[PDB]
């Protein structure tokens, strides 16, 4: 009948360079450690490999002189099976609105993972590079590397995240109250972050400090653009 979308007019500088398609991958963005402030940038590069896995839909409620008032707080995971995962929390008066608020927030907070090998090479990394940890308020995880074909040996909660990450082999162990899973999953996600923030002898050679996209593509942005 009537056709054509028009969606996503950027109000963000970084968003405009993507929309004009002078930034060709997310990998450039992460290398300059920029914020991402829009949820359509990620959904432009990807959007046909991102799945969601709604973990829990948890009530909370406070007390007032007229009685209870309940809001629903849901956690929603996100990730494609090539190395990018994310996670988000949001709460709202009702259910569906809170879920849809979290599916947006999880895309925003998406990060890459670094995968590595066991003790020898045959191509295609299958496991975690080094033995790392991640803590969120008395919960911690100890992601330990593992040989091929052992599968992910973990509890149900981190087994979601690590499987979406493409980390197919891992040994784990938990410590502390894992019953309150909001800590447990955020502590897993904390660990998965540290993989590119862990220094290894590979990375000891010095970087060349290539010029920023902000600098090079500034010529199009001298019109009125911000």
């Amino acid at each position: 009948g009537k056709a054509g979308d028009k969606e996503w007019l950027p109000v963000t500088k970084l968003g405009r360079l993507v929309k004009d398609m002078k930034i060709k991958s997310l990998e450039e963005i992460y290398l300059f450690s920029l914020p991402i402030k829009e949820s359509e940038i990620i959904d432009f590069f990807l959007g046909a490999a991102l799945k969601d896995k709604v973990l829990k839909i948890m009530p909370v409620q406070k007390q007032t002189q007229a009685g209870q008032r309940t809001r629903f707080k849901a956690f929603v995971a996100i990730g494609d099976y090539n190395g990018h995962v994310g996670l988000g929390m949001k709460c709202s008066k009702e259910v569906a609105t809170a879920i849809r608020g979290a599916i947006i927030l999880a895309k925003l907070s998406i990060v890459p993972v670094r995968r590595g090998y066991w003790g020898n090479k045959i191509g295609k990394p299958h496991t975690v590079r080094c033995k790392v940890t991640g803590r969120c308020g008395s919960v911690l995880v100890r992601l330990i590397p593992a040989p091929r074909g052992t599968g992910i040996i973990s509890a149900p909660v981190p087994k979601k995240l690590l499987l979406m990450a493409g980390i197919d082999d891992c040994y784990t162990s938990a410590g502390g109250c894992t019953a309150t899973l909001g800590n447990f999953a955020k502590a897993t996600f904390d660990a998965i972050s540290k993989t590119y923030s862990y220094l290894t002898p590979d990375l000891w050679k010095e970087t060349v400090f290539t010029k920023s996209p902000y600098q090079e593509f500034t010529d199009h942005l001298v019109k009125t653009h911000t």
Binding site: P35, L203, T207, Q215
Partner: protein, 82 residues
């Protein structure tokens, strides 16, 4: 990082800051590249090729970056004897 083939893997190879010798993650929004402009040094007029640096958030937030940026320019120019 190399494999059996020597084939390079890892989605991005991160960048390593000058005065701290450590690597800054995908989310780390206190880490700044800082461009100093070179000049010809015969007339003191701008000439093209910049000196570019990088600094991590940890040294920035404690207030040590000021010394690092000074020392970097002290081992090069423009700084003689300060």
């Amino acid at each position: 990082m190399q494999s059996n083939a020597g084939e390079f893997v890892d989605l991005y190879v991160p960048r390593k800051c000058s005065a701290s010798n450590r690597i800054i993650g995908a989310k780390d929004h206190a880490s700044i590249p800082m461009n100093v402009a070179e000049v010809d040094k015969v007339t003191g007029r701008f000439n093209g090729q910049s000196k570019t640096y990088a600094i991590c958030g940890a040294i920035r937030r404690m207030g040590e970056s000021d010394d690092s940026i000074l020392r970097l320019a002290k081992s090069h120019g423009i700084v003689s004897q300060n």
